[PDB]
Design a protein around this nucleic acid. Structure first.
Ligand SMILES: [Ca+2]
Ligand SMILES: [Ca+2]
Ligand SMILES: [Ca+2]
Lengths: 217, 185, 189, 185, 217, 217
RNA sequence: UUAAUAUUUUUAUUUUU
RNA sequence: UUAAUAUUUUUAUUUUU
């Protein structure tokens, strides 16, 4: 690349599939300003779409991310390591957080995948794939790789301290009360397909800080 | 980080006194200010413009907020008008003009022009983010939970008059910042 | 002196249009660049696209001024989708829109394949110092104005052409990264 | 480039209220301000001096423009007087004193002296050049086309009184620049 | 010339005719700050006066200056090159513009020729040669050469962008709407003569800037 | 690459689609040896193939390239900018001219696309895709990109000056008379497909020289 | 860190290295 | 760029090199 102009008409190819391969990674622990630090990135969600209709899921941004131990659950997402670690602290605050879309399908699969963060749990959760993607949302074709979505969160200075809680118990909280335990939720909308297929995985890249020791769950 | 800033001034309340007794109403300080769609609601006041915009966002925080008293009565009007801000909703609401006006309150003669009351609120650095909701749904929740949705309330007390009359208007000069787009389909 | 009447700045991004293709022929839609973007109330209309959020806020003001504007194409179709999509902005409301997909792809247009993600188009618009103040108006009422008068209400229009497919399909979405300034409160009660 | 500067102050309107209901009139901001020579005028207000001069030029632009309320009633007069500027003519005109006074508006008690309202207008650098016409012909054109002839309109709302009385006068302090001589044969 | 005074009483001759000869000129094209620049000077009007009465013409200052395809149109003036060029752009703005009177008659011919620019099309167009010349106007004897009239226009900084349109269609516009397409109009008033004669030509010297590509008329 | 031999057996991949992206280009104007110069490249043709049979189109190489105002017209191709410019001159001559095939379909689409230039309009225009491609023609698979076809034309020294005319009127000329107005025509043959599809666009890269001012069309 | 724009009991927005 | 005059939520006017 240089400088002299032209008409700029970029040419390129395009695969049949965008491959990704996640090898063994080691989480990164660390002591901080009186805090415990943990930076890592794990797969929190599998997006299998149905032929019946579009699918809209919701993941609560909480340290002990797991699937509410009930029946007919209102949430998705499991962040194993992050959970285990966080289950030993009472307070947390985010430093870095972003969700990366890892495609697991051919460039042939049509439709779109949508990611959107909602700051307040008392916010009218959309039911339309079209209403969901209206704004503040990552939108792409299910086959595309390397795209990531970063929730608008205060991570500078000293963010507000949120309190850790257990997935199910959180699930049980009212809406005006979920605020004290979570930054917000990540709604994952994916269009339907001709037939049963796992569009891809949703990878959570993060850096949480936790404090206040706790016993057994 | 997504913030949208909006600074303006709107008249949010009309204060007409009854002859039965003294009138003490309260305006909840919320972006989506309107009067609750219920039967005989608790919260008074409405700010059409502000809310129309506030309806577009899920979170807000204040940078500047003051209230001005605009009289509509003659110099011959007696009694007083009282303005007082209450930070916590879990705080025992007055039922007397003399109790309401005890402290931290603007007190004047209904006919007096151009006075203003400025509530105590953090506007420095980065205040706490508040979730905004709709008037109705708000008045519908516990005082413990009201905090996360509003800075506090503005209690407006006013003397009763000889006969039914409009004492004046109550203006709100502000500047909020909001973020978190909502669906207005 | 002089009550708060100053501008209110608002910058954001929003998806304002879904492009689906027909088998009849190539499709040439047009989006009017207005704060209160929504589809006109009439049947067999001229303009497409709706910006719910922007509009709602726009409904509260009477005057708008553009400071930042660009459009990004977001595919929804497969890599095997033939033909191409085209973007071309027209600042003058009285310059007859082209009739052919081809001569719509001129020197000031962006042309690409439907499946290609990530490209964007930035129209040439004065945003320096203090552009011309434009008046806010509703979609329907707008599409009712005469071209000569449409000018005072909109910066320009974004034409969006797209090859016809073998069979009905959703090509993609069209996003709008903007930054408008508005003033002149209205009545929304 | 031909400009002629003129800065002055003239009283352009007399506000007398009726007892039937609240009065809401509007003054278009045009150099050649006078009341439409027609039956059933949409507009109100007249500025003899200013127009006499404005009749000599074809183009104008503003540098300074404010409006002062001069009361004519006693301290015992109730109600309020409302002043509000509207930038675009294609904007839904209020029909309620409470809707009109919602925002961006001077509001006071009819008897209150010396207050003023300053509209939002570009006076910096070189504002847009506006063509000036005659009151009548003006009120006679579409809202879309009204823009090219005027900055905006000043809507004046006022409470109804017990009995027919002159509330006060409305003064306009300005400084316009005009060019393009016309024939005054 | 020097300095020492005297009484200053200038003497001079005076021809029977002031000759002018316009040879082939080449228009000057050029790329600008994202604009297209064109500076040239062409003859836009022929002034033939009648014996019946005084003549008052009007030329709309527009890029595509030509005469309205209408039967008994109201606008005169044709600027060929400028039109062709500008018919490929949607927006224009003036940098330099003036009208020069090129006489084509003897110093014998009496009367006057009047040039005046009117900024707003909604301005009461005079009908009198006397009312026309009242002010803001170039006034001279038809025989005299080298005089030019410059319309008072903002040409500094960044003048307002006007929109290009086609002569006829423009002619069709209302008055409140002509403003968006033209700076103003040039009214050309010329007194009558003893008998059929072409007083002279009206030469338009200019420098327009245009942008926004357009197709076929 | 070096020198030492081997057996040379080149290996490589192959996309699903060859992408192209035409951003905003600025045409290049310029003054010359008394001529007017213009170099640019615009899309002059859209090739949509039918399922009924093979398609054979013809584009006349002329400055004012546009489709014939008519019914059941015979010449395709529209070159907007080039036309507008050229509609202001009476004479033209080519310096550089080539046609580039810009594919808009998957490497899956079969068949061929054929480009061939014919110097004399009085030449028996083929009806067969097979006869068309016999010789002097660019032939490729619809999916392939970056291939261009250059018409065999004298562009050195001082080529013959041809005369500008308007598309329709040209369409009207006899054959023995078309010669004076055009270098030749470009026949575009494209095989049919399983179903309605736009194989691609045909981009015209050029450098014409024009002279002799003209008025309105 | 710098440039632009908007508000003023305050910060928010866009761009550049 | 300079000199004069007029207005002040602003610029406009005339002259000189
Ligand atoms: Ca709570
Ligand atoms: Ca108009
Ligand atoms: Ca011949």
């Amino acid at each position: 690349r240089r400088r002299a102009r032209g008409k700029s008409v970029e040419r390129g190819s395009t695969p049949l599939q965008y491959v990704t391969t996640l090898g063994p990674s080691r989480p990164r622990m660390g002591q901080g300003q009186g805090w415990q630090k943990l930076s890592h990135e794990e797969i929190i969600l599998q997006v299998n779409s149905s032929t019946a209709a579009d699918t809209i899921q919701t993941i609560p941004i909480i340290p002990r991310l797991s699937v509410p131990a009930g029946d007919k659950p209102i949430y998705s997402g499991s962040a194993p390591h992050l959970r285990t670690i966080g289950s030993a602290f009472a307070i947390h605050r985010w430093r870095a957080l972003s969700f990366e879309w890892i495609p697991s399908c051919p460039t042939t699969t049509p439709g779109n995948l949508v990611l959107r963060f909602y700051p307040n749990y008392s916010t009218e959760t959309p039911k339309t794939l079209t209403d969901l993607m209206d704004s503040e949302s990552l939108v792409l074709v299910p086959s595309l790789s390397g795209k990531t979505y970063r929730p608008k969160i205060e991570t500078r200075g000293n963010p507000p301290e949120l309190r850790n809680i257990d997935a199910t118990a959180f699930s049980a909280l009212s809406d005006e009360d979920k605020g004290d335990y979570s930054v917000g939720r990540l709604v994952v909308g994916s269009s339907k397909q001709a037939v049963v297929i796992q569009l891809g995985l949703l990878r959570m890249r993060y850096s949480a800080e936790m404090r206040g020791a706790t016993s057994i769950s």
